[PDB]
Amino acid sequence: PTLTIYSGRGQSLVEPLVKQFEAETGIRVQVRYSTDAQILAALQEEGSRSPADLFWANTAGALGQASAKGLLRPLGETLLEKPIAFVPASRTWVPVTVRLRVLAYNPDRIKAEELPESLLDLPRFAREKGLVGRVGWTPTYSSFQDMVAGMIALYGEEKTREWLLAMKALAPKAYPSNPAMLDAIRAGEVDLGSTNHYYVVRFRRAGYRLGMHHFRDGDAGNLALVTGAGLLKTSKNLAAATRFLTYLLSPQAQQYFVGNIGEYPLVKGVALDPNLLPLEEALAKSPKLDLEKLPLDRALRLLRETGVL
Amino acid sequence: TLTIYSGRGQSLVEPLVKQFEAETGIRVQVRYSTDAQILAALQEEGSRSPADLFWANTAGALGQASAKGLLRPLGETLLEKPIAFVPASRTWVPVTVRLRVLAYNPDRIKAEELPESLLDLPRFAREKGLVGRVGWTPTYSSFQDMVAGMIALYGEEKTREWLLAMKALAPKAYPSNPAMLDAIRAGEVDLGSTNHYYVVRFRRAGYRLGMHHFRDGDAGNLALVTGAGLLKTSKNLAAATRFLTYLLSPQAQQYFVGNIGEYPLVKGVALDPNLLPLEEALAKSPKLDLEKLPLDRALRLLRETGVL
């Protein structure tokens, strides 16, 4: 028995889990590591001999794309009852973890009670607190672009533009990664920036002091970012692949996601870091959107068009 | 109700206790103190003690509690779970292990040039022109355990020699391991002896940091074992045994590896890929009797030499 996984998630995240699954089950697992976008391309040129069994994606959007193309199998209630939220409308993939957009800040240099209630108001807050040149962002980062796509869905292009241009007027510093940006907050180069919650979790665990601000309920700045996995219609190993999806939603694998990776789990029965907002409170702060249908290409166009990207 | 006297920190313990209560209904009360203060408290309290479990930061403290007749023997069911470190007395269970290691700036120091033995660190440091650019943590529990391991392996005279040679490197003392690793990041120091999980945490945050293991059996690879024991006085044996069973469960063991960064002691726990596998890590540690570590001798030595 064998299993082939196309993974848009990183090898450092996936490998330890695949190894334990192999050790436990006797099933040989082969993984192809790529980006979600590149996997979507590969899936549309697949042979019939040894096709992939599973698509494990970094984003709901990529799985929604695979689903829209009719490449994914329906999943059953036995599996889909496990995650507490974010089960797709299509019901053709299972959400595995969630990552929350947040506002990171240095708590010694920035006062928690003064931070704005909406991401849209960040430029005004910065402007009025004297922080021109002291705001970071990550324009080339996947989740940042997802967040902008969220803003387009919720607010339309003009409020999003005014936001993008008002941010640009702040002379913000762009970082090639989130750890780079959080290191710059530590350094004193910038005081705050929009990021994913788990980067803050990782910095705190290393002993660094970072604040984690959430915007008002439903704000675009709180976008929930879901990872997930789907069974390919041409899987020749249906039982083994379903077994692997079940494994990803198991208490121990979910503790690995919370623990080794820092992401939010989607099952109960798992222990969170102290000072980390509990899972269901975190979910309540995110806007209600179809994560399978975020206007990502419009966001990218709008970012490329405005010279932020 | 279940009452735990914990030598482990609240940051580490709280999430596990919260989950155990939610799943069992058992109300858990934890007293947070140091291993040393818990040992004193348990004796002072005698048969009056409300303590069901002693969850220790160090195997040495469980050794003392056992030698002093405080602990109940445990069942084979529990003691067959850990892969290593189960006491002969069978009166407590190991839960995690941490390894002493040498952290270093991998841009300034070449992995292949590092010394095979902790005893040779002063020679290496002086050869590489690192006077005033070595860090250490003289007030930290695991550093003191490491010095105690050196007395056990090499004797007091060789350990005294090392301590004085270390002092002549004009090392920078840090009150915490994160502060030392931040100094390595800053370029203030180039290397320092630490616990493996501190390096794991820094790496997970995106920082590059080298992690050196010494030759098999070296004092610089000391295994630092945590564990828990059931107190003879306990009137809540069922809940206490349920809790120990939980600590050795795969999900709890994944918490230790993931949330905390420590090595697990049960099979089937997924570690970060760049971390030396469990059994390989254990193989490099000196094979000392955990309950015999001469910590008092080490503290006296550190005080005489003016390190403390």
Ligand SMILES: [Fe+3]
């Ligand atoms: Fe990321």
Ligand SMILES: [Fe+3]
């Ligand atoms: Fe520590």
